[PDB]
Design a binder for these strands. Structure first.
Lengths: 69, 214, 427, 41
RNA sequence: GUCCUAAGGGGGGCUCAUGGAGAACAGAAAUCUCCAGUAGAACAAAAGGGUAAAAGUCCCCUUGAUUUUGAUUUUUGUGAAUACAAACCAUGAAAGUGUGGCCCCUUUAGUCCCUCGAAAUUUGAGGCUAGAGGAAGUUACCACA
RNA sequence: AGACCCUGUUGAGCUUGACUCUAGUUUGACAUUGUGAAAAGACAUAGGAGGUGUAGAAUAGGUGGGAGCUUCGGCGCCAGUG
RNA sequence: AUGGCCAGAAAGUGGUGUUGACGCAAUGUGAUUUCGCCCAGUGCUCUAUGUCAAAGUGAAGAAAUUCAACCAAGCGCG
C-alpha cells in the first residue's frame, strides 16, 4: 500500500516537504484537529526520577512575572 | 558554415543575377532566417542595429523632419526634407501619415523636433516602425544619412522568420561577403543560444532562386 | 423551467453520457445545451451546464485540437457578444474563454478577438470580464514563467560586483514586465487602446464604478506600455486624478507608471511629475503621502528618465535625509536609478564611485530622447579578437566579423571575456 | 513584529478613506424577526 | 515580485542649529544685512561617547575601497580590528596622511596533478586541490525493576 | 513486597492512511505454446490541397524583398479598403 | 459452480457440499403494536485524455549508457 503512506498522501494533497507537520497528523487528523484534541490530553507535568517537577504543566508556570505599567 | 561556402554561394548568386538572367531593375540581396528552440511571446524579442561597412541600398529615399537650418543643409546636400509647418498642414490625418511612411523608407529628425514628432504625426511612424533618428546641428547631415542607409534592423516579433537586406547585385562580391558575414555574426551575437537557435539561413536576390547557407 | 431540479440535472447528465457513448454529436449536444445555459433562471442548472460544456471541450480537444468545433464555438460566443451589447449574457462567453484559456485548450487569436469585442461592450460586467481576461492572465503567465525557469574583503567585494553584473545580465535577458500572450495576440493594439480610452475612460456619461474604471485603465496602460503606443490625451486625463484626496490613488499612480515608456515625450510627462511632486511631496504632507509620491515618481522615472528637471531631481534626492524610513528609501531608490541611468543631474556628493569615475573617464554618455544603439561591431568582438591574437602569439612562441566565421565556442569565449571586462570595469 | 504594545497606533493609508476615531461610538444595528412556523391547532 | 541596507582618500576655504534687529510686493513662512551664538547642527544610535581655522559643509585632484608576508586582540581554523614590513600609487608647498566608511550532502574545474595494480589509448570512476549551492495512539485486561 | 502516585533504554495485549515489511489477491510481460487467416494503429518516406470577425473586386496563415513581371492577353505599381 | 466465503508449505489437497437462491455465506437490528430528507465527507460499487512498472520499440555513441515515444491494473475524472 504505497498510496496509503503519509508522504504520498501529502504529495497527492499538494503539501510540499518542509511544511510544518504536527506529530499525529494523518488522513483523519489535521493540525487543527490535533491541537483541538490535545487539549483533553494536557495537564501533566514533567518530572525526574525522584518526583520533583522539572517542567510544569500547562498554565502552572511557577514563575512570577514582572508586572509594571 | 564555411566562409568559402559563403564566397561560392554569393558567386553563383552574382553569376545568375548578372549573366544568366538580368532584370530591368537592380535586385537586392537579402538573407532569410529561420528560428528554433524559441518562444516569440514568452521570451524577449531581441532588437538591435548594425552598421554595414558598405551601403547595401543605393535607392533609399530618406525624409528629413527638422528645423530651417537642417532644411538648408538638406537642400545643400540634395536630400528632400519636410517642415513642421507641413506636418501641421497634414492635420494628423492617418491616411496622409500612412502615405508618407510608405513613400519615405527612413526619417531623420533634429533634437528640437524629435520630441514634437509624436504630437504632430501621432502614432503613424511608430505603427510603421519608422520612428526618426536624431541628428544634431553639429553632426554632418550627409554622414548621418550614410549610416542610416548602412544600418539594418534586427527586431523579433510574433513569428519565427526574419528577412534582412544585406546588399545588392551591382556592388561587388568581397564586400557582399563582408556584409553577409557581419549580419550573420551580429545575429549570432543577438541570439541567446547562438548557433543553437539558427534554423536556416538563405541568401537570394529580389527575383532569383534561393541559395541556402545552412 | 418546469421540471424538477434533480430530473433536469439527470437529463443533462444523460445527454453528456450519450455523447460519451457517441450516440449524439458534440455539436448537437452543445447547441441543445448552450441556449438553456444562457436563458435558464436556475443557478445550479447554469453551473452544471457550464461545467458539462467545459468538460466536453476538454474531452474533444484531448486527442487533438478540433479546429472546426473550436471555431464554431468561438463564432457562437462572438455572435452572442455582438447581438446585444447591453445584455449581461456575455459574461458566460467571458467565463468560458477564461476557463479554456487557463486550461490552454484555446491558444489561437480568435478567443483574443472575441474578448476584444467583449471589452468593447456596453455592459459593465462584460467589460469587466474581458478586462479581467487580458489583465489577470498575467498571474498565470508568471506561473508559466516560473515553471519554465524551473525546467531551465576585496574578494567579497568582487563577488558582490559579479552578482551585480549577473543581475544586470538578467535585466538584459529576462522577460519584459506586463507580458501576456493574449495581449500580444490581439490585433491593432493602438486602435484597441484608443477605443477603450474613448469609450469608457473619456466618457463622463459612463456610470462605471471606480474599481471597474481602474480595471479598464489598467488594460489601457498595460497595452500602451507593452506595445509602446502613443495615446497623448491619457496623460492629460491623469491630471485631475493625481491628488492625494483621490481614492485608490496608488492604483492610479501605478497605472501612470505602466503607461509611461521610452518613446513618450518628456514634455507630456513632466507636468504629471511636477503635479505629483507638488501634491504628494511637500512640507505639509504626511510621511506616507510623501513616500507614496516619491515611489510613484521613481516608477515613472524608471520608465522614462527624461521627464525630470535637474533641480527637481536634486530636490527629490535630498529627501533621503528625512527621518522617515519610507521617504529615505524612496529617495535613495530614485538616486540609485539615476546613478545607473543619468548621473549628470545628480550632485557630485550623490553620484557615488562608479558614476564619478565613468564621468571623469568619459565612458558615460548623456541619455537622449529617441537615441538607439548603433553598434557597428558586436559587443566584445574586440576582446575576442585580442584573445585570438593572444592564442596566435602563444602558438607562434610554441576584422573577425568581416572574415572569420563566428564559432559558438568563440561566441561563448567572447561572452566570458565581456563579463570579465565588465567585472574589471566595476572593480 | 512580535512586540505587543498597550496601544496600537493606526497607520494612514494613501488612496483610502480615513478611519473613524478610536473614541467613535456606532449606534447602527440590524434586527431579524423570529417567526414560529406552526399552523393553528 | 519591485525598493533600501549608505562614497572613501589628500589638500584648501568657511562655520552650524537658533535668537534679536532691519529691507517694495514679502506676511508666521520666499531672498538679502549685521550682531549674539561651546555645538544646543551635521557626521546613517532619535535623548551613548567624540569632533569647530574639523571628524561638519563647499571646492580641486583622485580611487590606500590595490597586491604580498608574518605579529597582536577579541579567544585549531576563521572573519573583524590594530601597529607595521615590501611593491605600486594618490594628494599637498611640505611635514605627513590614506591598507575603507567617526566608534554533512549535491554540483563545477584542473594544461604538466595522481591511480584503475599484465601493457597502451579512448569513455567512465576514484583521490587531491580550488570553488558554487543546500517513527502515531490506547490499556478500567494487564505486567516488571 | 497489597492498592494509589511517580520514574523507566520499561514488557506485553489492542487500534489506526504512524514507520518498514508480509501471507493472500489483482494486473502486465516471458516461458508452457502448437497449425492457419484477417485487420487496424504508430512512425518512416512519395506526395497532394487548403485558409471569411468586419471592411475590401476575391475566401488575407504570416514574413522579407519588390516596381516591375509578362505566356504579350494582361498582371502589376497608383487609387480604394483594411 | 471455470462460482461465493474459508483452510493448506505444497498437492492429481480440503470445508460449506450426500449442497444449488424457500440454498449457502457475511452482517446489523432484535417478540408483537407503533415508527422524512441529504451521496455533503468517508466507505463500497459501475464506466478518452491525465498519472503510468517490468518486458518490448526507436535515436545517439566505439560500447557501457543516455534520451525518447508506447505504456496494463490501480489512482484521478464521471
Amino acid at each position: 500500500g504505497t498510496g496509503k503512506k503519509e508522504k504520498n498522501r501529502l504529495l497527492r494533497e499538494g503539501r510540499t516537504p518542509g511544511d510544518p507537520h504536527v506529530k499525529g497528523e494523518n488522513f483523519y487528523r489535521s493540525a487543527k484537529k490535533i491541537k483541538t484534541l490535545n487539549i483533553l490530553k494536557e495537564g501533566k507535568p514533567i518530572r525526574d526520577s525522584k518526583g520533583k517537577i522539572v517542567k510544569a504543566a500547562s498554565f502552572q508556570s511557577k514563575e512570577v512575572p514582572k508586572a509594571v505599567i | 558554415i564555411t566562409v568559402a561556402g559563403v564566397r561560392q554561394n554569393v558567386a553563383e548568386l552574382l553569376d545568375y543575377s548578372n549573366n544568366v538572367k538580368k532584370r530591368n531593375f537592380l535586385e537586392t540581396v537579402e538573407l532569410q532566417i529561420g528560428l528554433k528552440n524559441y518562444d516569440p511571446q514568452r521570451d524577449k524579442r531581441f532588437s538591435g542595429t548594425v552598421k554595414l561597412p558598405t551601403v547595401p541600398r543605393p535607392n533609399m529615399s530618406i525624409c528629413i523632419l527638422g528645423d530651417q537650418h537642417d532644411i538648408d543643409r538638406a537642400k545643400h546636400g540634395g536630400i528632400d526634407a519636410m517642415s513642421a509647418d507641413d506636418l501641421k498642414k497634414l492635420n494628423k490625418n492617418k491616411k496622409l501619415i500612412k502615405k508618407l511612411a510608405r513613400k519615405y523608407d527612413a526619417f531623420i529628425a533634429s533634437e528640437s523636433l524629435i520630441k514634437q514628432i509624436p504630437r504632430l504625426l501621432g502614432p503613424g511612424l511608430s505603427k510603421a516602425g519608422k520612428f526618426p533618428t536624431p541628428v544634431s546641428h553639429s553632426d554632418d547631415l550627409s554622414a548621418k544619412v550614410n549610416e542610416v542607409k548602412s544600418t539594418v534592423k534586427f527586431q523579433l516579433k510574433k513569428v519565427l522568420c526574419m528577412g534582412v537586406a544585406v546588399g545588392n547585385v551591382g556592388m561587388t562580391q568581397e564586400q557582399l561577403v563582408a556584409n553577409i558575414m557581419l549580419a550573420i555574426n551580429y545575429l549570432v551575437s543577438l541570439l541567446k543560444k547562438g548557433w543553437q537557435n539558427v534554423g536556416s539561413l538563405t541568401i537570394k536576390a529580389t527575383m532569383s532562386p534561393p541559395k541556402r547557407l545552412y | 423551467t418546469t421540471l424538477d431540479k434533480d430530473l433536469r440535472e439527470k437529463v443533462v447528465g444523460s445527454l453528456v453520457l450519450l455523447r460519451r457513448k457517441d450516440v449524439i454529436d458534440s455539436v448537437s449536444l452543445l447547441t441543445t445545451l448552450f441556449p438553456i445555459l444562457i436563458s435558464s433562471p436556475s443557478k445550479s442548472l447554469r453551473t452544471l451546464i457550464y461545467t458539462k460544456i467545459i468538460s466536453d471541450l476538454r474531452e474533444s480537444n484531448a486527442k487533438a485540437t478540433n479546429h472546426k468545433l473550436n471555431r464554431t464555438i468561438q463564432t457562437v460566443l462572438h455572435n452572442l457578444l455582438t447581438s446585444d451589447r447591453t445584455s449581461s449574457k456575455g459574461l458566460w462567453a467571458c467565463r468560458i474563454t477564461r476557463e479554456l484559456w487557463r486550461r490552454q485548450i484555446w491558444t489561437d487569436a480568435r478567443p483574443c478577438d472575441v474578448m476584444k469585442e467583449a471589452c468593447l461592450s456596453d455592459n459593465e460586467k462584460v467589460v469587466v470580464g474581458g478586462c479581467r481576461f487580458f489583465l489577470g492572465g498575467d498571474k498565470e503567465r508568471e506561473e508559466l514563467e516560473d515553471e519554465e525557469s524551473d525546467e531551465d574583503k576585496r574578494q567579497k567585494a568582487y563577488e558582490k560586483a559579479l552578482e551585480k553584473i549577473k543581475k544586470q545580465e538578467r535585466k538584459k535577458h529576462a522577460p519584459h514586465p506586463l507580458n501576456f500572450s493574449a495581449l500580444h495576440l490581439i490585433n491593432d493594439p493602438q486602435g484597441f487602446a484608443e477605443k477603450l480610452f474613448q469609450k469608457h475612460l473619456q466618457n463622463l456619461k459612463n456610470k462605471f464604478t471606480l474599481e471597474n474604471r481602474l480595471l479598464v485603465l489598467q488594460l489601457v496602460t498595460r497595452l500602451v506600455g507593452l506595445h509602446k503606443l502613443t495615446v497623448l490625451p491619457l496623460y492629460s486625463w491623469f491630471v485631475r486624478y493625481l491628488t492625494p484626496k483621490q481614492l485608490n490613488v496608488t492604483t492610479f499612480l501605478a497605472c501612470l507608471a505602466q503607461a509611461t515608456h521610452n518613446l513618450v515625450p518628456p514634455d507630456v510627462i513632466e507636468p504629471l511629475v511636477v503635479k505629483i511632486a507638488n501634491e504628494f511631496v511637500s512640507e505639509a504632507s504626511a510621511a506616507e503621502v510623501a513616500a507614496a509620491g516619491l515611489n510613484a515618481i521613481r516608477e515613472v522615472a524608471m520608465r522614462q528618465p527624461l521627464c525630470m528637471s535637474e533641480t527637481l531631481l536634486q530636490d527629490l534626492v535630498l529627501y533621503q535625509k528625512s527621518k522617515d524610513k519610507g521617504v529615505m528609501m524612496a529617495a535613495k531608490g530614485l538616486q540609485s536609478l539615476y546613478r545607473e541611468v543619468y548621473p549628470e543631474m545628480l550632485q557630485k556628493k550623490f553620484r557615488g564611485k562608479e558614476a564619478t569615475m565613468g564621468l571623469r573617464a568619459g565612458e558615460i554618455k548623456p541619455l537622449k530622447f529617441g537615441e538607439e544603439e548603433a553598434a557597428e561591431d558586436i559587443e566584445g568582438i574586440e576582446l575576442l579578437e585580442k584573445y585570438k591574437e593572444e592564442q596566435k602569439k602563444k602558438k607562434v612562441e610554441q576584422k573577425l566579423a568581416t572574415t572569420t566565421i563566428l564559432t559558438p565556442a568563440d561566441l561563448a569565449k567572447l561572452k566570458e571575456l565581456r563579463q570579465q571586462a565588465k567585472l574589471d570595469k566595476m572593480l | 513584529k512580535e512586540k505587543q504594545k498597550d496601544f496600537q497606533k493606526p497607520k494612514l493609508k494613501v488612496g483610502k478613506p480615513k478611519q473613524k476615531p478610536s473614541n467613535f461610538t456606532d449606534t447602527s444595528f440590524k434586527t431579524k424577526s423570529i417567526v414560529v412556523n406552526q399552523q393553528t391547532l
